[PDB]
Point group: D2
Chain length 334, copies 4
């Protein structure tokens, strides 16, 4: 099996570990974080939104034992010091939020890992990959790769159908987002100077920036510059919805045509549903994006139309399932 | 003398309307009707989860409750036409039950003796739909049954009016991000109206749902009839809401700055303006019908083709209630 | 298989349905509520806290199809008008909350059902059963039985051990409960005139009465009149905790003896944990009561002691698993 | 003439302390220290999710920020000993960071040049722990570092005292059901202090946790040292909490009426009394250190053997803060 190390055993690190248990060909041999084994084992076993871990977890000498398998743990904040060469690490899943750039994540390679897959958008000379939208741009020789964001993974399959079938002129996005760990429990100073992420995450509708639409061109070059938008973070602990309002080249577009084109593009990353679901129904799903045909709207005034659509994602598990798909493909290629 | 008001439905809107009326001279709530008893009516006025403790003294007496010494008569009658409005010389009934959102049905109050009825919601039939400081001057005194429009309508109207007047509205789509309300279930359970989404645990979900606010904007602003549509996303905050509007405009080369300044230029007691990075809890209890947020203004340009996007905050409770009460005073002032 | 009808397809009724899916010898042939089949099917499929229905559901003619089997559905508020005679109903699971009385529940018997199991405490001379505490008091000649409350199923096995091993003098219970459907979404008149249940469920700590401790005599006669207490309903949508503070006859009681006696009494209804869990970790669990050893406390001043303990329960699934165990045992008899 | 206060840690307690001090004559906040900039400090003072908007004018100026024509200097210095307290003539530091909850560590402020330190939390080392209107009279003017106790301790002490004074306290156990606080994570994550329970999503769980409030009550009421213990359940409300106390007493044949009356007679500006069926949102912003709720009094009698339960509300924020600022003024007033 391909030997995987997880840097940052956080929400995405822990869910990625869970997901790897169920993909033949991949094995997590080491995790790194900023805490002790008592805490790491505990957070794997118990999960507020994603539920109890299936098998058994026991703290052992150099880390913890998950269903018979030993996993080594470390507490090394500076990634260049990690014993990656000695552990023969093939790929590092970079999930800390502190190495979101090609040169920063290069620290893992210096430590002896063959490749790095980052669990967020990242700056620098690197590929940004949404599985089943643009993973075929990987060739196996890449050393540092981005897995895009949760919002990008929800958006890209949708935007791609809109453009291929109808011709995208322009569009604006609003993502209605579960609150995340970069927000405060109570109003307090925010480390990044963000006066809105400073506010009590679970008591507020909180506007915030995102680059998912603005930077879509990294994933779909032919629509680069044609989208923008933002986020509204709201008090659900996981599960999100991307709403996209577009102008198209095709004229007299109907709801039926838009829904049908989306259904026709469905696969393991891109879901399709006509059920009147709500956000808790997407908790733990493995679709990168779940297109919801019940929310499609076409506004027509004379010859001029706006098309609006919406796709659900579990910002946690949807993204994680996409990340682990891209992980296996990157390993496959080499 | 003071305009004599009766509140039908001492719920969220009715109780807040009562509180707001204590702050406004010339209006007096003389009577309250609901489906409960005085112990409960008094308690719910005294204590309010989102809107805070009531400022005054509340005391249960025979026939109702005393508020700062002033007697309020209470009744527990579901059939509006049975109410003693003649004897109490009612001038306007604030209709906040959710069960009389129609011209003919609301006529029950007039039969019972009231002069006028103001309905706390959109309403069917041959009546005017009013957002204070957008189209309240369309009222001419002849009206006996009026709609105060919806919370979402009151947030949207002044925004849409500026967009159209200054830039020419071609078309647009709205999404409103809404506090959950009493027509939703606490736990996943069958829903009275067969709505499979309002059926779900209100404070645990992002819940899509319909709204007539954009579709029916033509009733408040005729010149844009049919040019807006949209929907809601109901989320787990107990009050406070945000309206996002994405539009196509006639004027070309529009900028963020131009839109913001135009919004600011139209500000008043109903239509507020802010450049502060506020969140939903900051508008709880505010008395603006709509609070434009200049920080959320965006412009997408691809060649000569633009989308323009704006957002205005509203406390679906106090924003709407403050507007409802301005319309009430105006509508009663026309009778004199 | 035993033919079951479910009256009230609500939180308990739907979860009992799910649970009944994995019990050979038990079959739901009919459901009754006050809504249409579309609503019923949808709420079976999708569940906010309990997750997606594991099988698959389809609306048909006079009810719905759940994995090959057909379930008849009705919309009859008056139970006496139900076709229980025609459908040969062996047991009605009474989950509406409107028939919590021996004589009231008799309507199902007149309608042609053989037995009624009520999913709550109920008045009149009938047996109140907590599975694995007193289900052997059933002899199979009973026509109407109560499955007790959620709190009673959490409290009974705890209380039994305390009395058996230490002798109960007297105690007070406080349960910290998930909010439930008898509460309002927003501050509003309450149907039962309760000025606390009238308040916004998910935005408050709400004190409220409970008859679980006061009526513990129905399940464990030897401690009748020895317990009382109340509830504090808080904003978690399911998952609850019972705390009990007692005076005991035995002297010099220690935390360790208490915990050891609980672990010794453990079974499939009464679990034991030394993990530092929180409420979301018991969501979906199948124990009626999970004793939490980390929460045991002993106060001593001279020879005088207060002993305190706590046990988790998913007021939803914990109760439901217990109700379905009682259903199967009750049905096995005549 | 004004006493010069510096607040170290402009957090939940630090900010509300600032607000409170605006009602106390002869007390002025001249300086604030934290880990951020004036943009952020000014914004968090203006807008408050649970306690509501600050009404005064706040603007960012060169040395810090200006509040209603009064200047406050701000710093961004994590090391208390490096603060310019001597230059600023600081009389008392209100230590609200959570990082100096120890006599010797808090000494850094004195070395920095502050005359006194009042810590907004329980604190280790050789110092007094003070609940205003329970034991503030213990202060004799020569204290250099003082603890203002915990929120729970302030809710508990006036209750424990009445019970002992009027009934003779044998022993008791406590559960406090608490609003979640900033020492908890928004989502399940490693916890900085290794606490596997505070590690969990604060707003989605009932979370058991320790509290020294009952166990360390002897520092406040010496005559009941060692007679109380208990813990906490942290639940998803953002502020507002309740202390439940179950006790055995020496006085026999005790009634709910005797207990409630004893509590009422003891009531003052620190210890409130209610017979209303309130919930947690009703105490948000209250200024009682403790609000006794007579509706929750219970007496369990089996033969001649009794258990007595009582319950007192507190806003863990404003109740505690109001108590801290009372102890602040009294401490400042000593030696004058
Ligand atoms: N949570 C989501 O919905 C989501 C979705 C998609 C992508 N992401 C991205 O994934 C990353 C992690 O997000 P998360 O929500 O899991 O955050 P998290 O805080 O839950 O996880 C971060 C973990 O990294 C650890 N860590 C921090 N610095 C470290 C260091 N220097 N060395 C080793 N460990 C360190 C922390 O202890 C923590 O356990 C971020 O880049 C985020 O943008 C998050
Ligand atoms: N809550 C909001 O944010 C909001 C905003 C704008 C408009 N509205 C509208 O105002 C109306 C009330 O909304 P709410 O949130 O206050 O609802 P609510 O449920 O809180 O209030 C309705 C009240 O009316 C009473 N009632 C019902 N039927 C009655 C009858 N037949 N006779 C007398 N009393 C009766 C109920 O007991 C309840 O107290 C609805 O039409 C709603 O659409 C609500
Ligand atoms: N929710 C819990 O944690 C819990 C736990 C233990 C016991 N219980 C008990 O179980 C019962 C149901 O509780 P719930 O939480 O599922 O409530 P619920 O409101 O979710 O379900 C009740 C269902 O019964 C239906 N109903 C009401 N009247 C009816 C009638 N006359 N005929 C047919 N159907 C009718 C309603 O439509 C609803 O779907 C109550 O007695 C309750 O006290 C609930
Ligand atoms: N919030 C409550 O309910 C409550 C009640 C009573 C007591 N307390 C106590 O008060 C203290 C603060 O609690 P809080 O809830 O306000 O926390 P908080 O996190 O909201 O505030 C702490 C503030 O101090 C700042 N800070 C941290 N280290 C600093 C440093 N070394 N120098 C300067 N500033 C620093 C932080 O940036 C933050 O703004 C804690 O000891 C807490 O236990 C809290």
């Amino acid at each position: 099996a391909v030997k995987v190390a997880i840097n940052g055993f956080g929400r995405i690190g822990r869910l990625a570990f869970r997901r790897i248990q169920e993909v033949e060909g991949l094995e997590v041999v080491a995790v790194n974080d900023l805490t002790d084994d008592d805490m790491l084992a505990h957070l794997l076993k118990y999960d507020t939104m994603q539920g109890r871990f299936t098998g058994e977890v026991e703290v052992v000498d150099g880390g913890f034992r998950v269903n018979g398998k030993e996993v080594k743990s470390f507490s090394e904040p500076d990634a260049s010091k990690l014993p990656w060469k000695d552990l023969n690490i093939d790929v590092v899943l970079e999930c800390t939020g502190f190495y979101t750039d090609k040169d920063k994540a290069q620290a893992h390679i210096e430590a002896g890992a063959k490749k790095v897959l980052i669990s967020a958008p990242a700056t620098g000379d690197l590929k940004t990959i949404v599985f089943n939208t643009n993973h075929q741009e990987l060739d196996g020789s890449e050393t540092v790769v981005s897995g895009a964001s949760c919002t990008t993974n929800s958006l890209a399959p949708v935007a791609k159908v809109l453009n291929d079938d109808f011709g995208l002129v322009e569009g604006l996005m609003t993502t209605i987002n579960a609150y995340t760990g970069d927000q405060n429990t109570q109003d307090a100073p925010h480390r990044k100077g963000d006066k809105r992420r400073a506010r009590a995450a679970a008591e507020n509708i909180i506007p915030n920036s995102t680059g998912a639409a603005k930077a879509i061109g990294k994933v779909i070059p032919e629509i680069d510059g044609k989208l923008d938008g933002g986020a509204q973070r709201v008090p659900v602990a996981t599960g999100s919805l991307t709403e996209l309002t577009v102008v198209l080249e095709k004229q007299d577009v109907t709801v039926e045509q838009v829904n049908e084109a989306m259904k026709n593009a469905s696969n393991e990353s891109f879901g399709y549903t006509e059920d009147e679901i709500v956000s808790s129904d997407v908790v733990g799903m493995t679709y990168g994006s779940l297109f919801d045909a019940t929310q499609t709207r076409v506004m027509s005034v004379g010859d001029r139309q706006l098309v609006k659509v919406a796709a659900w994602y579990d910002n946690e598990m949807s993204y994680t399932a996409q990340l682990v798909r891209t992980l296996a493909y990157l390993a496959e290629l080499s």
